[PDB]
From a paper:
Here, we captured four distinct states of [name] along the ATP-driven transport cycle, including the apo inward-open (no substrate or ATP), substrate-bound inward-open (no ATP), inhibitor-bound inward-open (no ATP) and ATP-bound outward-open (no substrate, but ATP-Mg2+) states.
Finally, we resolved a cryo-EM structure of [name] in complex with sulindac with an overall resolution of 3.77 Å, which showed excellent side-chain densities, allowing us to trace most regions of the complex and the bound sulindac. An EM density corresponding to sulindac was clearly defined inside a binding pocket formed by TM2, TM5, TM6, and TM12. Sulindac was in an extended conformation and trapped in the pocket formed by a large number of hydrophobic residues, including F156, F324, L363, L367, G991, M992, and W995. The -SOCH3 functional group in the benzene ring was in contact with F324 and L363, and the benzene ring interacted with W995 through π-π stacking interactions. As for PGE1, we also assessed the cryo-EM model of the sulindac-bound [name] complex by all-atom MD simulations, which suggested that sulindac was stable in the binding pocket of [name]. Moreover, the two ligand-binding pockets are partially overlapped, suggesting that the inhibitor sulindac competes with PGE1 for part of the binding pocket although not with identical residues.
Author numbering: 5 to 399, 405 to 633, 695 to 1299
Write the structure that this text describes.
Amino acid sequence: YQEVKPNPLQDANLCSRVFFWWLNPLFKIGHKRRLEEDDMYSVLPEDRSQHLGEELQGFWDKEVLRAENDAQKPSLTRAIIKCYWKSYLVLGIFTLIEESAKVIQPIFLGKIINYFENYDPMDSVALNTAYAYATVLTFCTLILAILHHLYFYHVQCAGMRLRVAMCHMIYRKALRLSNMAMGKTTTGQIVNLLSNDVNKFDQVTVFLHFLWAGPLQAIAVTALLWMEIGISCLAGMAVLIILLPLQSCFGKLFSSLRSKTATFTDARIRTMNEVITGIRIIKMYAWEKSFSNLITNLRKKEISKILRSSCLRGMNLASFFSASKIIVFVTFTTYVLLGSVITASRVFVAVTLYGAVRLTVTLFFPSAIERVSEAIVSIRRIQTFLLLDEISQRNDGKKMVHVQDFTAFWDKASETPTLQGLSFTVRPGELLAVVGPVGAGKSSLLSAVLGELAPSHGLVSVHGRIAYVSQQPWVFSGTLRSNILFGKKYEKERYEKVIKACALKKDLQLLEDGDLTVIGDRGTTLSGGQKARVNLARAVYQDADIYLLDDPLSAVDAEVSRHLFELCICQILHEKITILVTHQLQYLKAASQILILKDGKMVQKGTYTEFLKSGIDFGSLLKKKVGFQAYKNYFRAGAHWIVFIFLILLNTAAQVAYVLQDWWLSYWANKQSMLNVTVNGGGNVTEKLDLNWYLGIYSGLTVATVLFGIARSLLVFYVLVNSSQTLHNKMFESILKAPVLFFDRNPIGRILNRFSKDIGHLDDLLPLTFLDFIQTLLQVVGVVSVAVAVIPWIAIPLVPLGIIFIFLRRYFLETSRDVKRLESTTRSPVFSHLSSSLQGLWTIRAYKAEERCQELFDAHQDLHSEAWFLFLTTSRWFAVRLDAICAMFVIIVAFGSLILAKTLDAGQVGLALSYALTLMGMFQWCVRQSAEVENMMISVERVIEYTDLEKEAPWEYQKRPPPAWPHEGVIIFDNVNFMYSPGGPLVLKHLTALIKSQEKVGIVGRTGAGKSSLISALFRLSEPEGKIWIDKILTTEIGLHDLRKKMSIIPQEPVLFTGTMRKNLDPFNEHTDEELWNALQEVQLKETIEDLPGKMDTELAESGSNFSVGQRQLVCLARAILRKNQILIIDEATANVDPRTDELIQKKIREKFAHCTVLTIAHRLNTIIDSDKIMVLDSGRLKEYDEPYVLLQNKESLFYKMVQQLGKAEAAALTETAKQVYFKRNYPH
Ligand SMILES: CC1=C(CC(=O)O)c2cc(F)ccc2/C1=C\c1ccc([S@@](C)=O)cc1
């Protein structure tokens, strides 16, 4: 724990805490360089982990008394409520002064609105009394703008505290476990409910306080608007009592979808895994045509079901913007029809109020109804999880282990105990050998000695420290030295002695950094034997009194195991209590005592000498930023630019019809009080405005908004869902015809991440974010336009703010990237701290180390908590500097309009002031959407980068051979060379061979000599060098499928694909069922398939797991027989094959392929000596090419040495059958 740079919040006043002035050095540092983990600030030292964990644990433990004294029901929510209710109302007085300054504001606006109607003479007194009204209006909006971010931050800070308090108490509980219950459950859920049950706490507390502040406004504004003109206020409210349950009937219908189409988007990704894991095998089968139709058919229902909710979800965003002119149209058409007058002093006072009461329950109060059950469903689960059960508390100087009549049960449901009357006593210096069959109860006996097994009968006594090693090598994250120490002090001499006695010198010499290299989970880098070795070394390093070994020597070979035994067990622990368990009887001669277990009963206990005189046999008992190019490419991939121009025109004439909609309200108000009032003084006229002319125009103009909203929110979605439909087809038909070399570079994990993650982000998340930005940007351009097209004196003092705003954005959006990247880096150093501890906790509590289990977890919690405050206080710095340019524009539009009194007639005064009052609140939401768009735009690169992959050659080229090809198969190799990569190491070096008609020529060589490369060049897997001539026709002039369909191959690893056997044997349905049945009877697999009810349509599992390797080899042989090709190739098909089915396959290929040219490559020499000629390949070069018998006469040959290497009798039988077939072929008479 280093004294890093603390937070300056403690040395700051209230002004710098509100304005976030203490973030200047951090921004200055992040602007000039890159921020790292060593540049973060510390959290408040008041409650890091312990003051938040123990305070919550105390109340929960005290609640147990109030639950046991009555014994009715346990409650966990009560402990949470009685803990934070002490300070919850101190923050509830801030929601009463701030949320109430939005109702008095229209009251003050109306007092200035109705002032210009009496300024005929000089009335400075009336201006003197209005100066206060024009000052309170601009003074009230200051608190409403600069006193909201602090409250938001103070509310958001309460969530992370509860999250940390819940995450701290969930780990200390899993140290008093109930293993039988742990065995009943699965460890895949305890670590799982840690990334989803803590994120909801940071959101519910934000809108939870609006519950009692919501309906209050719906009464206050209701009364203030009923005190208006009259009872005509009910028609406008009648709409927003049915508009609320109207959007809830759409969600229920949407819930039927987006859950039904998951049987088409989760069925192709899994199938792609089967076809992409073996492209090396599927490429040379000419089966891409039979498999492309499967994915094409599946890609015929996803988009068709997506565009049945793409409209239902797009019509919802077109109503939220159009509902601002329906509540205003109805309330006036029922007020003008009753008979009254129209003045500008009773219009904007209610129009502005028509939004504050609207955006309170429509968007601000669904969350306090929907985000409550999600934050209460986890509480009724965590409580039950933490209240499962607990364990029973348990604890002459002579160190000894005494066991007398021990009898215990693993589970109470078992009728037969695993241990039946075990009685044995060991002493310091004796070696107790534990041997027995698999499952006799040795490991359970060691666990009982450790005390992990609950004793039902008998008593055990242990005196001293116990060092136990499990059968499965357990290891935690850390270096080798830290793993061996396990909290102990580092002693150079002792460490060297343990390393020498346990033989880690070769392992440290082979590894680069020695014992200082960090090891991940499970120790994947080191082999299991090395893990067992380092575990034994750590166990013996503890210098304990009792040692229990659970098979630590079986994970290595004989020599090293004897080494470790004779140098550690016989020498180091010759004075300690050792109870070792081994299955090898070679180490029982050095053991002082041998105890045998069988079915839980103690057979015999004694030394190795007593077992010898008894005549008992041990063997018998053991046998059973984004550039414009990407945007242009995404815009041009949807359709022609004409639809984009039409959409721009539609948007222009859907935005121009929104500002002009209120122009009629001003034209009607500036005509009623113009000359129609002069009836008593100023004139005498009884005429009035024509009701059948203004109302009709208003109705014809207000219908030009809903009709221009459905045809404006149903084209962008279609374009964006059609572009993704054509960008995927040009990315899938160019990944199956790729070279094999490309697949060997990228792994399977990095090649499957471009078809599941960034394949659906451009369908739902991209359009919903892109449409919400283009409809918000046109909404802010109409607010500055109405303030300049009225008073042409505001455009001059407007360029400094515009210049400041552009420089402020690219001063903040160049540093928040590092803050968000560092948080995600140290986001989860928890999951790999418990997943590797809950699987091997059987020894974490047998060392009395519970003290060093919480301090390590708290260290990883602080590292993550010190990175969340930095991100939470960062967003509150740009939002306090963006509200300072919006709280200045309102003052310069009021004071500049008040000085021009004798220029207007309150019309422009009302218009320009009713539009610049709602700017604060909508100018900050547009910036977050643009940032999200810019952040989600770097994701779409791989879908467009994989669209220009090179190809080798078309499947067919030209001038297919006449229907007489192929023939007997005279193969002529004329200086052919093969290379897996262009310019890489050459594999074949001038191979020249002549294969005659109907001859059996086989390939033999060591591993890596080039056996597979020969068949790879023969099947034209890669373009080879030279001239390879088959059937007197060059293979380069013939297409790939025309060559691959006329040749059959039996690979080394028989890979079978899922589906029916009909498609596996004949995917093109070119053969009849009778031929398939005849082939299956000839391969002798007809009886093994008749027992299944789906003989012709068995649903075969992945990779042929339902059948053995021999059955798969027979299936491939039947496939090659059904192919009826004149060229057969076998490469290591009989290496892992039992001798019976091996000789069966040999007889089958000798009977059916007698007139066919076969290429037999096998590792066993018994399946090659019966061939006509053999090819011994060495380092890619051929050495001898002749019959097997004439080669054996030369003792200096290589194949003779390989034959003699298998033994004397084997080589004798081999040369005997070789001479036999030689005399049979070359001398028939
Ligand atoms: C600050 C704020 C938040 C916090 C958040 O982002 O979670 C928010 C959350 C929502 F679900 C919806 C809206 C808002 C919002 C301000 C705001 C709301 C509406 C408008 S109107 C123009 O649609 C303008 C601004």
